[PDB]
Structures are given as structure tokens and as C-alpha cells.
Design a protein around this nucleic acid. Structure first.
Ligand SMILES: O=c1ccc2ccc(F)c3c2n1C[C@H]3CN1CCC(NCc2cc3c(nn2)OCCO3)CC1
Ligand SMILES: Cc1sc(-c2ccccc2Cl)cc1C(=O)N[C@@H](CN)c1ccccc1
Ligand SMILES: Cc1sc(-c2ccccc2Cl)cc1C(=O)N[C@@H](CN)c1ccccc1
Ligand SMILES: [Mn+2]
Ligand SMILES: [Mn+2]
Ligand code: NA
Lengths: 671, 672
DNA sequence: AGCCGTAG
DNA sequence: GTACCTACGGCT
DNA sequence: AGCCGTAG
DNA sequence: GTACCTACGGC
């Protein structure tokens, strides 16, 4: 019913185009030749049939619609002669997700409709380079470039080696992660088409993009691109804590247009989590309005909420405009965006990260800011510090939701190797409720556990009689009292046994599996605690050194200008005479340069000077600024002359941040 | 969706009805969960006053409320079974919140009246300034509206049941005229609440806002608030035709934050229509990407499309920064927006308008711009011109979709009175297809007719055997050929007969019901063709008059500065020494003013002068500017001194616009 | 009828 | 006004 | 086995 | 990635 067929009933001259969604589909339908060309719009990512059970595959709506459209049936019953189109054309967006969707479609054609490929019926379209998605093209341009048999370039998909192609679909699309990961590491780098070559190149294109530009944080600032773009967007709009909140829909529309060419919900939902004090150990966004709850209620629609940077986020963006980090071109070349943030606090470890990539994933727990900075300071004084010594500063993860960690052994393994299992428990106590009866009271729950869902789980166990001795279950949580979950215990039953059982059978006890993978030098890397801290500290040294160099050039440039102004003030009569005698700006400029040994920049500055600069207060200000400047330049040079002084400055600034933003440990690590 | 409280004891339990999930989550968090339950609604609710019982009972929102209350409904209503003794209506403090409140009270009065009689129904009073309950933090919601310690609730009271019956009937019933009369009669520019009063005030607030601030165009620029805000948003962001396309998501978020506090889809779809050349006779938006089709395909998601002003839209905004129109504060006081656009072409008539309001609706067809401007010119030369004479310029509507209008008699009635029915017919011809067989070919369809859907209607008629003689039906439309819909006719059947039947039984012939209502001085008004031209010409006289006055004010301000600069350069050594000798800015200003007879503004301008202005070509170059200004000042004064000269200037600027943007008529008017 | 177009 | 489909990895 | 979070 | 509720007035 989503299919827009062509009028001809002769398959030999008929072509069906497969496109990503209705955005693309509408340009496609308007621009086509309705006589011979059909359009079937799909719905974004389609089922990977290499990983799915067969009944699921047969019951999936997108899959059925293709089968019905092609008309050949599937597997054993496939009948090539019954095909309704001799050309099946894959026309996804010319981007990395476009590529993924193509690997998913080919995988379906190969496993289920193979003769179709063998017959040479499957092609790949080749839309132009410039556009965002096909939804961004005018129908006429899409017709000429991509669908016009006269000018289009199609690739026909050719099946050459079928042993090789089976091995290929299994490797890329199959359920064994390791083989796929190996394939990516090995190949990762910075009109007839063999189906194996198309899968390998298209999948690597997608997989690479997800690893380096989506799902993994950078080790230096702890951010993924969508977060870095959000925060940079708030900086560039002047959405500072002192400044008022800006509506979220404007922030999101802004980020979308300038830096992040993806769907609005991905951006808004990333921003929302950054504002949740139950998600971020040190929240990066300050939100006004409904930003979700521990119960998994979603945030209010973006038209209603407002947001701005938290104060600690200013520390992430500090000195970004002092040539501290490298800018790069944005997605369409009309803007510039930061490659990384200055990150004056160790954000990766402080807020942690979780991302599902391709071939790999990352799980990094959050940490206490005071402990992390103290760890960085200990490292700065001792490059050969061991993990055990570092743990004297950093006890373990510190969750925003507090709770308990059981033992140091999982933490120790994770810090040493980057992988460990950490056991988390809710904070629970047994107390009397009167009448000789007792209750269990939970005041803190494990990190990332949905409270309401945890309670549902307990209720279901009680209902199914899978747990004994619970008379009542209520959520007494309130803004005023904090989290409070009350489990009433049957009189004379052992509450401690019931609690132990709750730990065994519900998320009241949950584990955090540490998998510390981050982008180091543009590549994913499993890193230990020390390595994550070493990368953070080198970054801070580079940022501070660069800021100091930038500030020196700027101060020197400004001093240069002020010397010219001071010269002008010393010979103001002569300066005025020279300018009056000149016919043009260009002559005056040359004459000032010749007569007073001034640079072009100095002369330009003098010619720009307003007459009010001539008053007593203004002359003094020019002289006062120059004298202030000379001292500043001397201070900057001192820092750059001595690596130790530079390093000390890094330590001092970290320390300042520690004292301003460092807070108490929340999570209790129990021996 | 219900988030219930702990207590089982209704006497102390309260249920809060909120607009959506946006307010629901803050409400869930902020409430006392022991005694406060939350039921989020799904925006506007069924009006039970206009609906039959089967539809009422099958509505999910009505069902959830019935289920939650526990009382049952109507005849089976049981007050004792109520699960809460306080049912609290908590919508946003805005016009649409007020509407939701009338809809809820309508359901309660009709299906659960004892609940009101018992005193169980209340209205919360959240604070204003928020633009949504989703906007408030949970602690603010609790303290201001849900905490029993600080909250102010209105208990709804039923005093006169006869009067309330009548009020619910008039405000919410199916008779539009009584409701329209109520709005016309009442419209104008400590813990208990009478239900009749609450209904009359809440409904009037909503109805008036929709009439004056949503669904009806201004007679002066032909726009509704959302369209005006979009265009002003484009001008402000500098999205002119010379600049590159801006992404739609960014344009929309900007309009949302700054001027239009409503949904993104309302803004984006309004912008998309301005871009469609099958909708707008002179498109106001230049769109890049998928902007929808005549088959009712919607535009691509806003993440993909880009947009900017068309060239003609520059004429809507021309002179906006010369104090030609009044600006007003935006919705939250942080911005300024235009009350109306200068509108240098008659956009109301040119592009037409359709809007469903409350108590009334509007339907104004588009027109040919060359014709309209000629009409305005003729009118400007003769205030007593008649409609018939005006029709010598303005033949009738001119649809972007072309086609035919049958006869001039509906056009005439609509122009004379503002109401008329106009028959639009497709352009269709009969031609041979070979073998002695024929086809009907359609290349133009009526305005606002979905082509795919019209084709479906035809296919339906053929399959149901309600029409004889059709053997095939195809849409051969393409970019190369334009609309082409082909109906094959059975050999030896009369094709003209088949075509006449298709006109009678399908949208291939359709009617446009003209009902020209626009806002005139802030009030809706049914207007005829001449009255719409008159208000337009007045607006233009006013814009040009104000523009001239602004320019004159500006030019004198400038001449004044230059007289100070002339004096400064003539005495420059003494000027500089005066400044050098002054300790501060203030002292220099006083000294310059006393010594050289300079105003405060002249002296500031002298102190702001850069040294590079002392170069040679300046004494004369300043004198060059000063000389042109005097001439210009004289030119502006002449215009303000003679109405006829001002009127001629309006005529001239309209004529230039007609020659630059005026195009050929598309819709053919056949007599008859 | 169910559409048209700004709203929740 | 709102609700689900899909990919992807690892842990239970 | 369903969840975590950026994506279509 | 997409689909389907509601108000409102007139034909
Ligand atoms: O609830 C439901 C339930 C079902 C359903 C089905 C199909 C279907 F399409 C949808 C459904 N829905 C909701 C709806 C899906 N939504 C996703 C979000 C999208 N938002 C656009 C947007 C706004 C912006 C912006 N960019 N883009 O830039 C900044 C300003 O605001 C609008 C469509
Ligand atoms: C999947 C990819 S892509 C990539 C790469 C290479 C070069 C340029 C750009 C990129 Cl993106 C490297 C790997 C990879 O697996 N690296 C190994 C290191 N042993 C590994 C194994 C396990 C965990 C993390 C890392
Ligand atoms: C419904 C409203 S509100 C309003 C009004 C009054 C005063 C201030 C602000 C406002 Cl908005 C006037 C009417 C109305 O019906 N006007 C009559 C013309 N007398 C009408 C009748 C039929 C068609 C159009 C217009
Ligand atoms: Mn894409
Ligand atoms: Mn509202
Ligand atoms: Na008809």
C-alpha cells in the first residue's frame, strides 16, 4: 500500500526503486517516469535477516512488502519468471547509514532471493555527492542525475564467487562479533559491481563511521560528536549559566543546521540526558522544565523545555577561542566546528560513557571529581605511578545515584585492564514499622536502573509467588523526602532473608561491566585507568601551552598597535598635519608609514582612532594598557621558557577546578 | 496512562487531569503520590456536545476518565463509587488550555453532573509566564499548584441548571450562529467558580484568540500570525533570495523560540504551503527539496528541506525598518515582532486564504496580480468606482492550478457581497487514441483538488458501475508533460457524454465557496471586492506616508550632524586642542558645544570622528552628501505637502511591482 | 462524507 | 496530542 | 532477554 | 523510520 507502481505491466521494461522513507519517496515519485518506474519507500533501517529467526523475517512488514512487490516469492518457491520488474534498484541516501541499509537489503536479497541477483536484476543507484538525503533534492535534479536512463549511472550487482559471498555475509552481518571486528580493524583507514566488494566497502564505511564519529567518546574530552556539537552550540549562542535559558527547539534546530546532520530526536534526547542529575555525575546541561525521571518518564516535548550550560560546562569550553584546539570544517563546509573541547576537567572518567558501536561497545562508569583530579595531580608528579598508587586517590566509580559497590576486586581488574565486573547494590535497611512488624526501606538504587520497572519486577515475583513474605510494596519517593521504596514484611518472617532474595532476583543488585573503550588518536582503544589519565593530562598540557602561545601573539600584536598609538600621541600635531595634507586614505597611510616609521597595521590603527581618544582620560588608558601588556607578555614568556612552570600552571588550574566543583563521594565501596 | 495514588480512601484523594505527557512527568515527580493521582490527556478532547453516543463511548480519553473516576456515567452514575473526591482540571494558562477546560466541563456536565453538584470538580491555577506546563520544574508545580498549603483551587459550582443547560448548548452545540452571536456580543480588546461563568469566559477567550490571532488573515497584508512570523523570521535571519538556502529545522526552531509559541508541525506545514506553486498563486517561500505534491504527499521531514524568501516576498517586507508598521512585544517580552507587514502588493487577494475559525470561517480565492494592481489603480483614480467597473480589471479568481471557471455570475455575486459559489472545471479534451477509439485527457484540475484522490473517485465509480463507458484510467503526469490524466473510452461510446457525467459525479468539476472574511481593524468582517481593495489602498497610503516621514526625520537628523562636522573641519585645530585640553569625555562635550554653538548630538559625532576623515576629499565629500540631502529633504517635503503627490507615488510603486511580478492569467473564465 | 488548515 | 519498528554489543 | 543510547 | 486522535465551519 506504500508502493507507487508504474502503469506498464511488462516486466521486462519495468524498474522498481527502493528508497529510505517518504522524504526521499516523494521526490522520487514526482521525478520518475510513472510508465516504467515504481517506487517503494521503506522505513529506515530494515531487519538484518542474517541475525533474525525465520518466523520473524516472514512476519516483518517491510520484508513482506518487498516480496509482494517483486512478486517472485522467497526461498524454495522463488520463481524468477514471476518477477514484476527486471530492474530492482537500491536508492538509499549517499551517506554512511545509506550504506548500511544497502548492506541490509543485499543480505536479504542474497539469503532469500538469490536468483534475483544471479539474473542480474539487482542494481545500485548513484545519487549526487552534494545533498543531505534524497529528501533534499528537487524532483527534477533527482531525475536527471539518478533515475534518467539517458544519464544515470547504475551499478549492476554481479555474483562471482558464491563460496566467498557466503563467507562474506556471515562475517559482516552474522552474529559473531569478533570476526566482524577483525575485518574492520584490518581494513580501517583514513557499472558492474561484485556483490562481495559492495558489501565489504559499504559495511566498512558504516562501521568506521559509527566507531569514530558516533558511538564512542574521545579520550581527551569524554564526548561523542552529538554531545560536543550540542555543547558547542550552546557556547556559540552565548547560552551561558548567567544568561537566561534558551528554548530547546531553537538549540536543536541550530545544532542540526550547523553541525549535526541527523534527526532532531537524537540531538534533543542526547541533550536531555546531559541535564539529568540521575544520569550525569556532573550534569553538563542545566534544563528548565520536564527533563525526565528515574522512572523513565520522558522529557517534555522540545517546544516546552529550555536549557543552558551548567557552570562546570564552562570549564569544558574554557579557552576554546584561544587556539587551544583544532577546528575543522563542518559536514557541508559552511561552518567550522571543534574537533575536541579544551576539557579543563577530566570529563570522560567523571561522567563516564556508554555506547554501542559496530564490532565493539564501551561502558565507562562515572567517577568522583575530587578523586580524579587528585589522581591527575599524583600522575603529574610521577609518570611511573602504578595503578595501585593511583587507586589511593581514586577509590572506584562514583555513581550519581550513589548506592554501594561490593568489594574492590572488580574495580581493580577494570582499572588494570579496562575490563572488570562491578557489583552494585541499592542502599537498603531493615526497620520496625510497629506491631512487631518490619519493613525493608530502599533509599538509593543502582546506576541506570529504572525505579518503577524494578518495583514492577518485585510485584510480579510476589504475584507469581516466586518470593515469599512480602505484605506490601509502595513507592514513597518524593521531592521532599528523596527516593523511598518500602517493602512491608509479613510479621515474624525474616526480613534479611527476604532482602537477600530480592538481591538475587531483582535489579536491587545489579552489575556494571566495565569496558573502557575510547577514541585515542582517532582509533578505538581499550584503556586502563592510568592510560585514560595520561591521555587526559597530555591534552591539558597541550591546551595550556597553546593558550599561552596564543595569548602571547595576541598581546604582542596589541602592544604593537599601542606603540603606534603612543607614537601618534607623542607627535599629534605632525600626525594631524600628515593626514590633512593627504588626498586619500591610501596616501595618508603611506605618509604615516614613511614619516613615523610605522607599520601598515600601526598606521591603519592611527587613522581609525577617534577624536575622543585625545582626551586626558583616554591618553592615560592607552598608556596604562601598554604598561599592563608588557608585564603580561613577560609573564607569558616565563611560562613558555620553562616546562616545569607550565606543568605547575596545569596543576594549579586543575586544583582551582577541584576546589570549586569537587564534591563528596556518593557511592559507598564496601569491603 | 493513569498514575494512581497510594491511599484507597477517596475522601482524601485527588486526581489531576493534565494536557499531555509534557506536564504529566513534572506532575508525577512533584506530587504527593500518597493522595494525588495524575491522568495525562492527549491534547484537545472530544466535544461531547457535538458527538453521538457511539463515538463518545469509543473515545479512549473519555474511557480513561470514566474508568479512573469509578462512578460510571449518566443514568448509571454513582457518586458513592467515586475514587477521588477532588477531580482537578489542570491545563496550561493559555487559550488552548482554556478550550480544553470547556471541553472537559462539557463532558462532566453531560455525563457526570452529580460530580459537579457534589462539589468534587475543581480548576487548578498554575502561574502565568510559562508557555506550557512542560516548562515548569516539578518543585514549582508542587508549590504553586499542587501543594494544599499554598495552592489556590477553584471549586466549580452549579447554580442555575436551566442557565447552564443553555450555556453548554450555545457555546458547545452544533448551531454556529448562536455561538457566533455570543462571541460578537462579548468580545472586547476567592475559591469558587460558577460553571456558567467559567464556560462563558474560558470559551470566549479561546474563540476570540482563534478569530484575531490564528485562523483569519489581516485584510492589509493577507496573512495569519504564523505566516507573518515565518516571513519576518526569514527577513530577520537575512534569508533573502541572494543568500543561500537555510535548513528548515533551523528556521522553524528560530520562529518557535522568538515569535510563535506553538507546535513545530504547525509552523513547518504553513511554510511548506507558501512554497508550493500548486497552492500559492505567488509563492512566498523558495523551497529546496521535497515540498510535497498535488497528490497529497507531504513535504520531506524538516531535517532535509531548506528554504528562503522568494523575490516577491521582499515586496511584503519592503520598508519594514522605516517605521511604516507598528511593532509589538512578542509572546514572552524578549522580542519585538511586526503587527502587520508593509505588503507592497495586494497579497490578501493575490494569494487568497482559507481558515476555519470559531463562529465563522473564511475562503478567499487567489487572483491575478496584474489584474489586482490595475484594479487598485482604477480605484485610486475614482473612489466611487463600482464593482462592475472593477471587474473590468479583475475578471475573477486566477488559480495557481489554472483550469476553467464557468460563467461570471457566481464571481459577480461573490465580489458584490463577499459570498458566492464559483464552479471550477478541469481542463479536459477529447482525442483519438487509434483504432477508431478515443480518450478524454485532463491537463488541469480544480484548485485544492487532490489529483490522486480524484482519480480514486473515478476508479470507484467505474468499479461500482455508477458510470458507463470507461475502459482504462491512468495518471501520466510527469515533470516533462505536466498534469496528464487519461480516461480511455469504450469504442463507439459518446465521450462528451462520459465527460459530462464525470463533471457531475467527481471532483473533476468542483465548487469554490467564496466567503471573504478578513480582519479589519482587529475585527472579523465579511467584505466585498471593493472594500478589500479600499482597505489595501489605505494601508499603502499609510505605509508610504510613514516611510516618507521616517526618511525626512532621518535626513534632517543627518543634515544636522553634517553641519556639525562642517564646523568641526573648518575649525579643526581649535577642535582638537579643545579635546586635548579636556580631561574627560563630558568636559570635551560641554566645551565643544559652548565654544562652537554645537548640539549634544553634533559634539558626540565630532568626538566619534576618526582621524582618517581629515583627509583631503572630505570637506567637499561631506559637502557633497550635505548637498544631496537638502535636495532629498525638499523632495520628501513635497510628498507630505500634497496628498495627490503622495497618492501618485503609491501608484508609481504599484506599477513598478506590476511590471516586475505581474504575469499572465491562468484560469480561463468561460461564458457561460 | 470528508475535506480544507492552524491548533493540542 | 501520542507509539512504536529497525541496527548495533555486552551483560544478565 | 530486554535493556542501555545514537542512529534510519 | 512512520500513523492516527481531537476542535472548528461550510458544503
Ligand atoms: O507519537 C507518534 C506516534 C506514531 C507516529 C507515527 C508516525 C510519525 F511520523 C510520528 C508518530 N508519532 C510522532 C511522529 C514522529 N515525529 C518524530 C519527530 C518529528 N519532529 C520533527 C522536527 C521538529 C523540529 C526539528 N526538526 N524536526 O528541528 C528543531 C525544531 O523542531 C515529527 C515526527
Ligand atoms: C574496529 C577497529 S577500526 C580501527 C581503526 C584503525 C585505524 C584507523 C581507524 C580505525 Cl577506526 C581499529 C579497530 C580495532 O578493532 N582496533 C583494535 C586495536 N587492537 C581494538 C580491539 C579491541 C578493542 C579496541 C580496539
Ligand atoms: C465573532 C465576532 S468577534 C468580534 C469582535 C468585536 C469587537 C472586538 C473584537 C472582536 Cl474579535 C466581532 C464578531 C462578529 O461576529 N462580527 C460580525 C460583524 N459585526 C461578523 C458577522 C459575520 C461575519 C463577520 C463578522
Ligand atoms: Mn541519510
Ligand atoms: Mn499550551
Ligand atoms: Na463534480
Amino acid at each position: 500500500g506504500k508502493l507507487a507502481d508504474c502503469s506498464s505491466k511488462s516486466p521486462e521494461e519495468c524498474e522498481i526503486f527502493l528508497v529510505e522513507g517518504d522524504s526521499a519517496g516523494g521526490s522520487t515519485k514526482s521525478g520518475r517516469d510513472s510508465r516504467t518506474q515504481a517506487i517503494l519507500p521503506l522505513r529506515g533501517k530494515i531487519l538484518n535477516v542474517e541475525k533474525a529467526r525465520l518466523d520473524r523475517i516472514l512476519n516483518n512488514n517491510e520484508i513482506r512488502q518487498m516480496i509482494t512487490a517483486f512478486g517472485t516469492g522467497i526461498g524454495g518457491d522463488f520463481d524468477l519468471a514471476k518477477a514484476r520488474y527486471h530492474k530492482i534498484v537500491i536508492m538509499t541516501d549517499a551517506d554512511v547509514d545509506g550504506a548500511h541499509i544497502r548492506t541490509l537489503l543485499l543480505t536479504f536479497f542474497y539469503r532469500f532471493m538469490r536468483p534475483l541477483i544471479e539474473a542480474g536484476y539487482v542494481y545500485i543507484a548513484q545519487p549526487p555527492t552534494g545533498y543531505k538525503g534524497l529528501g533534499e533534492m528537487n524532483a527534477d535534479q533527482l531525475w536527471e542525475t539518478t533515475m534518467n536512463p539517458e544519464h544515470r549511472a547504475l551499478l549492476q550487482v554481479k555474483l562471482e564467487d558464491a563460496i566467498e559471498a557466503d563467507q562474506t555475509f556471515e562475517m559482516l552481518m552474522g552474529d559473531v562479533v569478533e570476526n566482524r571486528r577483525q575485518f574492520i580493524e584490518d581494513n580501517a583507514v583514513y557499472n558492474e559491481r561484485n556483490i562481495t566488494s559492495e558489501m565489504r566497502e559499504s559495511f566498512l564505511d558504516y562501521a568506521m563511521s559509527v566507531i569514530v564519529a558516533r558511538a564512542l567518546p574521545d579520550v581527551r574530552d569524554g564526548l561523542k560528536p552529538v554531545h560536543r556539537r550540542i555543547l558547542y552550540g550552546l557556547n556559540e549562542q552565548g547560552m551561558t549559566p548567567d544568561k537566561s535559558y534558551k528554548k530547546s527547539a531553537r538549540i536543536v534546530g541550530d545544532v542540526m543546521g550547523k553541525y549535526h546532520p541527523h534527526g532532531d530526536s537524537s540531538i534533543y534526547e542526547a541533550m536531555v540526558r546531559m541535564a539529568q542529575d540521575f544520569s550525569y555525575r556532573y550534569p553538563l546541561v542545566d534544563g528548565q522544565g520536564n527533563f525526565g525521571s528515574m522512572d523513565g518518564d520522558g522529557a517534555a516535548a522540545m517546544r516546552y523545555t529550555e536549557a543552558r550550560m551548567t557552570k562546570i560546562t564552562l570549564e569544558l569550553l574554557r579557552d576554546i577561542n584561544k587556539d587551544t584546539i583544532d577546528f575543522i570544517d563542518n559536514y557541508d563546509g559552511n561552518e567550522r566546528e571543534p574537533s575536541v573541547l579544551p576539557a579543563r576537567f577530566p570529563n570522560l572518567l567523571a561522567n563516564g560513557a556508554s555506547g554501542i558501536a559496530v564490532g565493539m561497545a564501551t561502558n565507562i562508569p562515572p567517577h568522583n571529581l575530587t578523586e580524579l583530579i587528585n589522581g591527575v595531580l599524583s600522575l603529574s608528579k610521577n609518570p611511573d605511578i602504578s595503578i595501585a598508587e593511583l587507586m589511593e586517590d581514586i577509590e572506584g566509580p562514583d555513581f550519581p545515584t550513589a548506592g554501594l559497590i561490593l568489594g574492590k576486586s572488580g574495580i581493580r581488574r577494570a582499572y588494570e585492564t579496562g575490563r572488570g565486573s562491578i557489583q552494585m547494590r541499592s542502599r537498603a535497611v531493615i526497620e520496625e514499622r510497629g506491631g512487631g512488624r518490619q519493613r525493608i526501606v530502599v533509599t538509593e538504587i543502582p546506576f541506570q536502573v529504572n525505579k518503577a520497572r524494578m518495583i514492577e519486577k518485585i510485584a510480579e515475583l510476589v504475584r507469581d509467588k516466586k518470593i515469599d513474605g512480602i505484605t506490601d510494596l509502595r513507592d514513597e519517593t518524593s521531592l521532599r523526602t528523596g527516593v523511598r521504596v518500602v517493602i512491608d514484611v509479613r510479621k515474624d518472617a525474616n526480613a534479611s532473608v527476604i532482602l537477600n532474595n530480592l538481591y538475587k532476583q531483582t535489579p536491587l543488585q545489579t552489575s556494571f561491566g566495565v569496558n573502557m573503550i575510547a577514541l585515542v588518536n582517532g582509533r578505538p582503544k581499550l584503556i586502563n585507568l592510568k592510560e585514560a589519565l595520561v591521555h587526559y593530562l597530555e591534552h591539558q598540557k597541550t591546551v595550556v601551552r597553546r593558550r599561552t602561545q596564543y595569548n602571547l601573539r595576541k598581546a604582542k600584536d596589541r602592544a604593537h598597535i599601542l606603540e603606534g598609538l603612543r607614537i601618534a600621541l607623542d607627535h599629534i600635531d605632525e600626525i594631524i598635519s600628515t593626514i590633512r595634507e593627504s588626498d586619500t586614505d591610501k596616501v595618508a597611510m603611506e605618509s604615516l608609514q614613511q614619516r613615523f616609521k610605522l607599520s601598515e597595521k600601526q598606521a591603519q590603527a592611527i587613522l581609525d582612532m577617534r577624536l575622543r581618544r585625545l582626551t586626558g582620560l583616554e591618553r592615560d588608558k592607552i598608556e596604562a594598557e601598554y604598561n599592563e601588556l608588557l608585564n603580561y607578555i613577560s609573564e607569558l614568556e616565563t611560562i613558555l621558557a620553562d616546562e616545569e612552570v607550565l606543568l605547575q600552571l596545569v596543576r594549579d588550574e586543575l586544583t582551582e577546578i577541584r576546589d570549586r566543583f569537587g564534591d563528596d563521594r556518593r557511592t559507598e565501596i564496601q569491603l
